[PDB]
Amino acid sequence: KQIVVAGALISRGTLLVAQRDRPAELAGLWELPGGKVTPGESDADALARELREELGVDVAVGERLGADVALNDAMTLRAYRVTLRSGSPHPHDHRALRWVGADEIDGLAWVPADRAWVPDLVAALSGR
After folding, report:
1. Do 101 and 28 form a contact (C-beta atoms < 8 A)?
2. Rounded Cα–Cα distance for residues 89 and 37 (Å)
3. What is the β-pairing status of strands 75-86 and 2-11?
4. DSSP track, the chain
5. How many structural domains does the chain have?
6. Which is nearest to 63 in space by CA: 80, 79, 51, 43?
7. In 10-25, which positions are buried (b, 16+ CB within 10 angstroms) versus exposed (e)?
8. Do the beta carbons of residue 20 and residue 28 sit within 8 Å?
9. How many CB atoms lie within 10 A of CB 90?
10. Cβ partners under 8 Å of residue 103, min gap 6
11. Domain that holds residue 12
């Protein structure tokens, strides 16, 4: 399986979410930003590179968040908690960025692949 890594950037019990601009079927919906691991990268290398490219920030990559998602038979999607070491996030590809708290996560319109992470993300902001 190809691995796609996503980041849950958490700061003082708020989470950075990123609203997709493409393709049409996901545009307007919200995600944990990230992308494909390229051959030879660790999960951490790939995720740090992706958030550098997409947000212009340097993150420190931590623990897994939630369950892996089977995107297909050939592709798996995995989230990690991350923290903000340097930079201030600005959307490069995305339509918008938002910081949300625990009681804001459930009402967001998530991309489908991310939806099952909602409990896990709420628990992360809650300390539970």
Report:
1. no
2. 21
3. parallel
4. -EEEEEEEEEETTEEEEEE---STTTTT-EE--EEEPPTT--HHHHHHHHHHHHHS-EEEEEEEEEEEEEEETTEEEEEEEEEEEE-----SSSSEEEEE-GGGSTTS-B-GGGGGGHHHHHHHHHT-
5. 1
6. 80
7. beeeebbbbbbeeeee
8. yes
9. 11
10. none
11. 1-128
End-to-end CA distance of the chain: 31
The number of beta carbons lying within 10 Å of the beta carbon of residue 91 is 15
Distance CA(83)–CA(108), nearest Å, equals: 22
At 2, which CATH number? Answer: 3.90.79.10
Method: X-ray
**CA nearest 87: which of 53, 51, 58?**
58
